[PDB]
Design a binder for this molecule. Structure first.
Ligand SMILES: [Co+2]
Lengths: 250, 256
């Protein structure tokens, strides 16, 4: 019986659910966007028919109205089911307050080791800022963002390999760099412990537009943007050395 | 020198936040699932109307058939998208993996009450009248997922309750099934009031009041349904509506 380990398990589980929660926001957003493309196509081809059949007997008009109804019902479903759940969530609210950066980094380090990296035989080499720098930011959201980047890099790492966790903080920006060497086999291996589900670990390997990050990292991107900072990573691919970078103003 | 009789406050805070994210997670998967199921009927109806148009335009100008082919290509593109953009992301809550193990029920019921009171019910001035099972009953189930399911049902009933109202919570063993009941009186005004504390976001509480098919649970209760089904059990609740008395019932087999 250990209540301090109970707390770390609960916090790691909380953070994994937050990362999965932001991934589902991306899925809803992508689903809403991608499902409209065939609808636009159905509509514009139906418009071609409407125009060429303005002089149509009742049965042709009824059938064309059937096509139009099928389109309208899909539009309303997308509005009602995929866009509505994100009405107020699209803009991420945060609460900035000062906190000592180094203890948060220490806690993050300890948490990823406790919850995944130790089990996975992935070492984490940490380079942490000296002195006692502080940051005005949402400590809980930054904690989640740091945990998500670091845990994603551990997830992409095979046993015996290392992840580097370097964080700096000058007068301009506080920047966290997490670097890993990507093992696609370990990332997909059902036999190994994982923090994220299989879809998130598959989705990671897809290519995407430059503005976009892996969906399991969506929390990091939105937290970075809410603080007026940035988040980026190089593409995950087998054998790649990938750095994930989180910068927020100090 | 205090004597602890409940989980520490910082642990209750982390559990509440964890469980609230899990519930929100299953809600979004429920939206994806709703879209996946409900897109099929319009697409099927369009397929039939396109066949009707094809016959009725059989000897019309061939570009008209090309328009119809374009419509049909769209229909088929939409069908092809459903698996990848709606079904693939929700796959692991759709079939929730669980680990069943024996655990004592009453300590979990007690921890759950402490959690809901600490996180929401006390601030909302809602009384949870609890009746706890006699004896030392045990359950072979996924304790963490049952904890989450119980927390979600109770917290939802508290979300529906105005200040000074009551939520009744009781557990029974009906045959081979072990059933937890939660009963509340629904105040739509309290569900929507932004001056009140809330565990779930405004959309989840607005969605609770939407009208759906009876087979469909409120989306904020999706976690409860998925956890129930994963255990080979059931989750039932009446529609949330202003002024209604609503019972939520979670039934799982007592032996995995
Ligand atoms: Co577009």
């Amino acid at each position: 019986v250990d209540p301090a380990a109970d707390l770390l398990r609960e916090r790691a589980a909380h953070y994994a659910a937050e990362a999965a929660l932001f991934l589902r926001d991306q899925a809803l957003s992508t689903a809403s966007h991608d499902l409209r493309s065939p609808l636009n196509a159905m509509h514009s081809w139906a418009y071609v028919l409407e125009r060429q059949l303005a002089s149509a007997d009742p049965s042709l008009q009824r059938a064309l109205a059937g096509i139009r109804t099928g389109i309208d019902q899909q539009v309303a479903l997308i509005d009602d089911v995929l866009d509505a759940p994100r009405a107020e969530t699209r803009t991420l609210a945060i609460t900035a307050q000062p906190f000592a950066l180094r203890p948060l980094l220490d806690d993050t380090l300890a948490l990823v080791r406790f919850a995944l990296a130790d089990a996975r035989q992935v070492s984490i080499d940490a380079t942490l800022p000296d002195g006692e720098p502080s940051l005005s930011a949402d400590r809980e959201r930054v904690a989640q963002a740091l945990w998500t980047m670091l845990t994603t890099a551990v997830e992409a790492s095979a046993a015996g390999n290392r992840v580097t966790f370097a964080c700096t903080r000058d007068g301009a920006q506080c920047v966290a760099h997490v670097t890993c060497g990507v093992s696609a086999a370990a990332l997909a291996d059902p036999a190994l412990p994982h923090a994220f589900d299989a879809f998130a670990r598959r989705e990671m390997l897809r290519s995407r537009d430059a503005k976009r990050v892996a969906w399991v990292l969506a929390l990091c991107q939105r937290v970075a943007l809410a603080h007026g900072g940035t988040f980026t990573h190089a593409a995950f691919a087998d054998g790649a050395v990938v750095t994930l970078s989180l910068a927020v103003p100090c």
